[PDB]
């Protein structure tokens, strides 16, 4: 457990955390520098366009063996 | 007496070779009417089977696009 209910502690912490609005809270230049690597894996992963912009097409002309 | 077999024998040898050719002749131009028919519908084919690939090469190449 009855004492082990006193969950309370915890929300309190969540609370504080989540009432803070200025980036990530307690930053630490890595944030950036981990995230940037992730956001290069990405990169790799779905191509090196401006994924902000509709995609140029030039086609292929067709091939005959 | 002779005078009719070797006459005779030579006679039939004739016809034998009449019969002969004959066969042989129309055998001839059935060979021909033949390699004709074969020419005739035959040959399209071969640049149907032409046209009939870029057909397909193209379709797929606007499907893949």
Redesign the interface.
């Given at each position: 457990l009855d004492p082990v209910q006193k969950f309370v502690d915890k929300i309190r912490e969540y609370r504080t955390k989540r009432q803070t609005s200025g980036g990530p809270v307690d930053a630490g230049p890595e944030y950036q520098q981990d995230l940037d690597r992730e956001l290069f894996k990405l990169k790799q992963m779905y191509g090196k366009a401006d994924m902000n912009t509709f995609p140029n097409?030039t086609?292929?002309d067709?091939?005959?063996e | 007496g002779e005078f009719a077999d070797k006459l005779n024998e030579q006679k039939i040898a004739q016809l034998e070779e009449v019969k002969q050719a004959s066969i042989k002749q129309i055998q001839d131009a059935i060979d021909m009417e033949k390699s004709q028919q074969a020419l005739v519908q035959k040959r399209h084919y071969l640049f149907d089977v032409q046209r009939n690939n870029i057909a397909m090469a193209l379709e797929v190449t606007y499907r893949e696009r």
């Open positions: 097409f086609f292929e067709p091939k005959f | -």
